[PDB]
Amino acid sequence: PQFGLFSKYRTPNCSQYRLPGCPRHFNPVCGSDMSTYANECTLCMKIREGGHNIKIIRNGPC
């Protein structure tokens, strides 16, 4: 897999979602910070400093 998940946890790759804002609502991933999310306003907001450096708990549906 990509790097693994045993180091911290498995961190999401938000190298996209590059909107001036955030369209739609959809939450693919699962948050270690107790937030089911995935987008520019959910993670990428969080991830840059909306929460932490997010590690999703689950990389997919929950």
From Swiss-Prot:
Top-rank taxon: Eukaryota
GO biological process: acrosome assembly; spermatid development
Mutagenesis / variant outcome for changing residue 25 to A: Reduces inhibitory activity towards trypsin
Modified residues (Pyrrolidone carboxylic acid): 2
Site feature: Reactive bond: 24-25
Key words, A-Z: Cytoplasmic vesicle, Disulfide bond, Protease inhibitor, Pyrrolidone carboxylic acid, Secreted, Serine protease inhibitor, Signal
Cysteines engaged in disulfide bonds, as pairs: 14-44, 22-41, 30-62
Tissue-by-tissue expression: Expressed in epididymis (at protein level).
Subcellular location: Secreted; Cytoplasmic vesicle, Secretory vesicle, Acrosome
GO molecular function: endopeptidase inhibitor activity; serine-type endopeptidase inhibitor activity
Domain Kazal-like: 8-62
Gene Ontology cellular-component terms listed: acrosomal vesicle; extracellular region
Effect upon mutating residue 24 to A: Loss of inhibitory activity towards trypsin
Disorder this protein is connected to according to its UniProt record: Spermatogenic failure 29: An autosomal recessive infertility disorder caused by spermatogenesis defects that result in non-obstructive azoospermia or oligozoospermia. When produced, spermatozoa are immotile and have abnormal morphology, primarily defects of the acrosome and head-neck junction.
Function: As a strong inhibitor of acrosin, it is required for normal spermiogenesis. It probably hinders premature activation of proacrosin and other proteases, thus preventing the cascade of events leading to spermiogenesis defects. May be involved in the regulation of serine protease-dependent germ cell apoptosis. It also inhibits trypsin.
Protein name as catalogued: Serine protease inhibitor Kazal-type 2
Species of provenance: Homo sapiens
Gene: SPINK2
Shown chain mapped onto the complete sequence: 23 to 84 of 84
